[PDB]
Design an enzyme around this catalytic site. Structure first.
Site, short mmCIF file in Angstrom:
data_model
loop_
_atom_site.label_atom_id
_atom_site.label_comp_id
_atom_site.label_asym_id
_atom_site.label_seq_id
_atom_site.Cartn_x
_atom_site.Cartn_y
_atom_site.Cartn_z
N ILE A 7 0.79 -1.22 0.00
CA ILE A 7 0.00 0.00 0.00
C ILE A 7 0.82 1.27 0.00
O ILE A 7 0.25 2.35 -0.08
CB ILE A 7 -0.91 0.09 1.21
CG1 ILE A 7 -0.08 -0.14 2.47
CG2 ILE A 7 -2.03 -0.92 1.10
CD1 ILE A 7 -0.74 0.30 3.77
N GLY A 8 2.13 1.16 0.13
CA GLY A 8 2.90 2.38 0.13
C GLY A 8 4.39 2.17 0.25
O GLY A 8 4.87 1.05 0.33
N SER A 9 5.12 3.28 0.25
CA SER A 9 6.56 3.27 0.39
C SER A 9 6.98 4.43 1.30
O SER A 9 6.55 5.56 1.10
CB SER A 9 7.21 3.35 -1.00
OG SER A 9 8.25 4.32 -1.04
N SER A 11 10.08 6.59 3.69
CA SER A 11 11.35 7.19 3.34
C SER A 11 12.33 6.04 3.07
O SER A 11 13.30 6.17 2.34
CB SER A 11 11.84 8.15 4.45
OG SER A 11 11.69 7.61 5.75
N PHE A 12 12.03 4.91 3.70
CA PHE A 12 12.77 3.69 3.54
C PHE A 12 11.81 2.54 3.61
O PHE A 12 10.93 2.53 4.48
CB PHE A 12 13.75 3.47 4.67
CG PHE A 12 14.95 4.29 4.60
CD1 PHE A 12 15.29 5.08 5.68
CD2 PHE A 12 15.79 4.24 3.48
CE1 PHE A 12 16.44 5.83 5.64
CE2 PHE A 12 16.93 4.98 3.44
CZ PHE A 12 17.27 5.77 4.53
N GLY A 13 12.02 1.55 2.74
CA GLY A 13 11.17 0.39 2.75
C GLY A 13 9.80 0.57 2.13
O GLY A 13 9.40 1.63 1.66
N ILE A 15 5.56 -0.60 2.76
CA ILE A 15 4.54 -0.98 3.70
C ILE A 15 3.45 -1.82 3.03
O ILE A 15 3.02 -1.52 1.90
CB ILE A 15 3.88 0.29 4.29
CG1 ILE A 15 4.94 1.23 4.86
CG2 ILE A 15 2.93 -0.10 5.39
CD1 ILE A 15 5.87 1.83 3.83
N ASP A 117 10.08 15.42 7.90
CA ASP A 117 9.33 15.04 6.72
C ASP A 117 7.83 15.29 6.91
O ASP A 117 6.99 14.45 6.60
CB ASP A 117 9.60 13.58 6.36
CG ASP A 117 9.25 13.25 4.92
OD1 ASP A 117 9.32 14.16 4.06
OD2 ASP A 117 8.91 12.08 4.64
#
Ligand code: 15G
EC number: 2.7.11.1
Length: 283
Positions: A7-9, A11-13, A15, A117
């Site tokens: 479902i998403g990305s 700042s790192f990795g 989700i 952020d």
């Protein structure tokens, strides 16, 4: 945990949605290929645990070719809700949002970290009984700004390359100055105005290098006086942004003043204290 769709990305990795199989509860699962950053983010969350509007980590560990961090499921992001509300929030909703966002940022600061952020994508509404609470997510770019024991503020630093998302970055971040408390708040200011206008004047600027594009954004940001940026809207928004840019690198922001600015405006507008956001009226 049963693993689901992406479902998403962050700042790192990346989700994914998931399930606490035996409890039949849906969860959010962030995966990091086993430069590692997930464990560090996990530590910050744990350090923020127990605060209002902060997600709960259910589990942290490694499985296979991944470091994993399971989190309690949350609702739509403010960018999502913005879209659902036709990309323009009513003044009352922005004010209801501003009151909670200043508070979330203040809490992260009270715990010795800056977020770096602040943007619509990193604020998600809660679920169930906390459906009207604004949470803050993704500490992948968070940094300590004062020693925990002594509270000695980090030193002023120059020539820093940009970290965060350019659209909402502070003028000083663009100018390579180390971010501090004032910057998380200035970013919030652009976020609020973005919600008011539907877009910012330095959006959709085309460039080549994808590094020359930050330059255009920077120049535009410094070429757009605050009074122009907030023209046609309550003076509080301009007052808020000016206050943010007037903060000395290590100053402790007067969060109460900023909230009061918007609260007084709320009172003067005659809005009802029922806490009904625009999206609460979708039928
Ligand atoms: C506590 O963190 C979360 C809790 N719950 C959700 C539920 O999100 C959705 C549910 C149904 C959907 F259809 C959907 F698209 C998204 C998402 C997160 C989340 C964490 C992060 C991101 N999102 C993007 C940026 N970096 C992150 O670290």
């Amino acid at each position: 945990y049963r693993l689901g769709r992406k479902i998403g990305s962050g700042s790192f990795g990346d989700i994914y949605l998931g399930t606490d199989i035996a409890a039949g509860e849906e969860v959010a699962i962030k995966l990091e290929c086993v430069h590692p950053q997930l464990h560090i983010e996990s530590k910050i969350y744990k350090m923020m645990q127990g605060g209002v509007g902060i997600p709960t980590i259910r589990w942290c560990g490694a499985e296979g070719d991944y470091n994993v961090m399971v989190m309690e499921l949350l609702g739509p992001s403010l960018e999502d809700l913005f879209n659902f509300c036709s990309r323009k929030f009513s003044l009352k909703t922005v004010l209801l949002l501003a009151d909670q966002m200043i508070s979330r940022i203040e809490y992260i600061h009270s715990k010795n970290f800056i977020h770096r952020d602040v943007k619509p994508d990193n604020f998600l509404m809660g679920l169930g009984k906390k459906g009207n609470l604004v949470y803050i997510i993704d500490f992948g770019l968070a940094k300590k700004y004062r020693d925990a024991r002594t509270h000695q503020h980090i030193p002023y630093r120059e020539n820093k390359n940009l970290t965060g998302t350019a659209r909402y970055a502070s003028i000083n971040t663009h100018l390579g100055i180390e971010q501090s408390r004032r910057d998380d708040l200035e970013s919030l200011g652009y976020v609020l105005m973005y919600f008011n206008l539907g877009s910012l004047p330095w959006q959709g600027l085309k460039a080549a290098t994808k590094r020359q594009k930050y330059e255009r954004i920077s120049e535009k940001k410094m070429s757009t006086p605050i009074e122009v940026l907030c023209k046609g809207y309550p003076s509080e928004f301009a007052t808020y942004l000016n206050f943010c840019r007037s903060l000395r690198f290590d100053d402790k922001p007067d969060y109460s003043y900023l909230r009061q600015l918007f609260r007084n405006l709320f009172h003067r507008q005659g809005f009802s204290y029922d806490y009904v956001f625009d999206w609460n009226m979708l039928k």
